[PDB]
């Protein structure tokens, strides 16, 4: 899909990878972020869950898919 470009996580998920949903930070239900981005951000109180994904890419750093308050340390804007 179309997205922001620049300062985004590129991470891509294979047949047996792990990601995180966060209902608090997502723009829509299929957004997700990779394990390092989830752990290097703050989703303490958030309505998150582990996903066992067969594909896609991390949305961290992309404000058209994820709230900037939920970006991790390494993907400012």
Contacting positions for a second copy (CB under 8 A): 1-6, 8, 10, 12-15, 19, 28, 30-32, 51, 53-57, 59, 62, 64-65
**19 pairs with which residues across the strands?**
34, 51
Say which entry of a second copy, Zn ion, none residue 43 contacts (CB below 5 to 8 A, set by partner kind). Answer: Zn ion
**51 pairs with which residues across the strands?**
19
Nearest-approach distance from CB 16 to Zn ion, in angstroms: 17
Q: Which of residues 10-69 bind Zn ion (CB under 5 A)?
A: 11, 22, 24-25, 34, 37, 43, 46, 58, 60
Nearest-approach distance from CB 76 to a second copy, in angstroms: 16
Cα separation, 8 vs 16, in Å, equals 22
Assigned token pair, 73: 């340390």
Helix (H) or strand (E) holding 51: strand 48-51
């Amino acid at each position: 899909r179309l997205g922001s470009g620049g300062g985004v996580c590129g991470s891509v998920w294979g047949q047996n990878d792990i990601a995180y949903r966060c209902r608090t930070c997502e723009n829509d239900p299929t957004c997700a972020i990779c394990v390092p981005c989830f752990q290097n951000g703050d989703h303490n109180s958030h309505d998150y869950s582990i996903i066992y994904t067969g594909g896609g890419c991390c949305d961290c750093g992309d404000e058209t898919a994820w709230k900037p308050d939920g970006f991790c340390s390494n993907h400012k804007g």
